[PDB]
Amino acid sequence: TKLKAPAVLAYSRKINPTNALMFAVNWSDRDNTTAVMVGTKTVAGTQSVRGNPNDADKGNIQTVNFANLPHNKNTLLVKYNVKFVGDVFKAELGGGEYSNTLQTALENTDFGTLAYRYVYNIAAGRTLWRNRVGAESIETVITVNDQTFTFSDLLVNEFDEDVDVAEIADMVAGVLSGEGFVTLKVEHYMLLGEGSEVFPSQEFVENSKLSKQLFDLNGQAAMHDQKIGNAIRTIDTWYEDATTPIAVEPYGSVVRNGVAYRAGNKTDLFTLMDGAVNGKSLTEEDQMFVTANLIRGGVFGG
């Protein structure tokens, strides 16, 4: 026995968001959208690094990218489309023995809690990352198969029971449990105030003159689709000493805190995945974690 893995085994992304475009609107006039633009501003700092104090003198003086709301509109709108996709247990490019034993292992997983946590991360505005900082009110409009759901300020770190989140999560769980797909056009309205600086996705650059460069599409401020998709799967509350939901990862790994939350304590994806294939009984929360990693995607080879 002991089906190990295909070395080539990989799964695809079952939750595909678009690039979250940023627009400037008013809280009452949400139809007059204007492209928030990514400009560049120059900056004179103080050269304050942790190490040597003898270069605290003279300017830091460099250019960065900035994106502010114009001072005639006080609301930031974030447009994206999240497409949940079915056939989640089939391997896109992995094998056909290990994948179907994993399919039969997770065939009784609770897709309802999975879909509710995804639609809650969409609807509470967790896809907004620092744009929620100092927001009067966060209104999320989710249009799914010609049905508009409006959400007020929900508490994000706890997945409290809401009937409209459960309503959208019904078709999202129906998609994720079987075949098919569903599309969620999500519009965020946050009253950031007139002229408030917004926070689009920053870019990775090496030889650029900009110290910080924001992601843009034809100059319009936008968030990365991988950033939005990372904030979809910030549902993991089933690791050891769970306090806050972290992103669904094969190791429970957060880059920012610098510590993996499921590595070294036999609660990672690969040990539970090999156990689920080899026939030991999985509990419900780690079954949901393994299914969440399957619909996240990733090469589970090695």
């Binding site: 190490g51 040597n52 003898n54 270069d55």
Partner: protein
Amino acid sequence: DKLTTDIADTNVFVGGWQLTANPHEYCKWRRGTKNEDLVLTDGKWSGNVTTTKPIQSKIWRKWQGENGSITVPEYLLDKTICYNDFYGGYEN
């Protein structure tokens, strides 16, 4: 065979050559290589130094430096001495 009881020219019984400049030219006290000094001034190095990062695997103690100078042979001046906080000079 070097500290012998002869006078030679670079020897120890030197006689006749004390009159000349020969025991101070061919027998040089602290005869070293050319030795130029790359000097660290407030964290900023002078010549072809290029600070680098050490492996941070097992370092127990690493003290930082901002002033001072390093003595580099002229042979290794050709390339960057690549000064580092943990281990000073090398060839990389």
